[PDB]
């Protein structure tokens, strides 16, 4: 793994950009190339170094125009650092909440969805489960470029795998029914999450199931409740949204089908 195993001193750390459940993110500079990169400093963890690297090797092969590339990892000193390509406009959630809606119009929202579906079709092809698909994990570049990031990150940390609490911790409103029930994930659970992401995009970054307590979500879903069509959301996009939320994962469309659907919508809408 010499092509991507780095040393902390290989990168100049700058300001903190933010952080999440896995660690903090900083803007950094890969000295060798005077290249600005994103540096995620993972929390202290117990995961086997061998298991970590094998997982990271898989991620290193994820190469697509709409997936944030893994550039390297610093593993000589635990906790490990994850170096990825720097996205100039931050996460998609904040982007949508602060954007100029006349600029980021219906065609742009469609473009963003198209890009994300392309990236996911690729992950599906690689049988790579993202497990954290959501607007917070979509990053923005120049000219409305959108890239899916932090795919499979959960498999690089043991973290709170085990707790004495009853039940488990989840980003509940993005979690497919079967995942909540069994704490197991698949490409299909990523499809369900993609549906919630579409809703996030359609609403310019609103929090899903507004007014519904997290603890009430599963029951509602079991009884067929689903978020209603967002204001201004095209009927066909909502249709896809609803297909993503089929109770049986088997009944949900594949990302290849979703991407094809969006490419068509994007084409027609281009005119």
């Amino acid at each position: 793994y010499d092509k991507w195993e780095m040393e902390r001193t290989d990168i100049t750390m700058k300001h903190k950009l933010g952080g999440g459940q896995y660690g903090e993110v900083y803007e950094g500079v890969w000295k060798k190339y005077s290249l600005t990169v994103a540096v995620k400093t993972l929390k202290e963890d117990t995961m086997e170094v061998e298991e970590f690297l094998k997982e990271a090797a898989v991620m290193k092969e994820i190469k697509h125009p709409n997936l944030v590339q893994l550039l390297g990892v610093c593993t000589r000193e635990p906790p490990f650092y994850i170096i990825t390509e720097f996205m100039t406009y931050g996460n998609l959630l904040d982007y949508l909440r602060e954007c100029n809606r006349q600029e980021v119009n219906a065609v742009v929202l469609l473009y963003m969805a198209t890009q994300i579906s392309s990236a996911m079709e690729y992950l599906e092809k690689k049988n790579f489960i993202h497990r954290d698909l959501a607007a917070r994990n979509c990053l923005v570049g120049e000219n409305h470029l959108v890239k899916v990031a932090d795919f499979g990150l959960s498999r690089l940390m043991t973290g709170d795998t085990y707790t004495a609490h009853a039940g488990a911790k989840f980003p509940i409103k993005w979690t497919a029914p079967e995942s909540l029930a069994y704490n197991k994930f698949s490409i299909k659970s990523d499809v369900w999450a993609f549906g919630v992401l579409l809703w996030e995009i359609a609403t310019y970054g609103m929090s899903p199931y507004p007014g519904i307590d997290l603890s009430q979500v599963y029951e509602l879903l079991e009884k067929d409740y689903r978020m209603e069509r967002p204001e201004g959301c095209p009927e066909k996009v909502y249709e896809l949204m609803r297909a993503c939320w089929q109770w049986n994962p088997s009944d949900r469309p594949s990302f290849a089908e979703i991407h094809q659907a969006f490419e068509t919508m994007f084409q027609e809408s281009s005119i």
Binding site: Q21, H165, A166, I172
Partner: peptide, 8 residues
Amino acid sequence: EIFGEFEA
């Protein structure tokens, strides 16, 4: 709040 605990 994004995270919450869920007991099946």
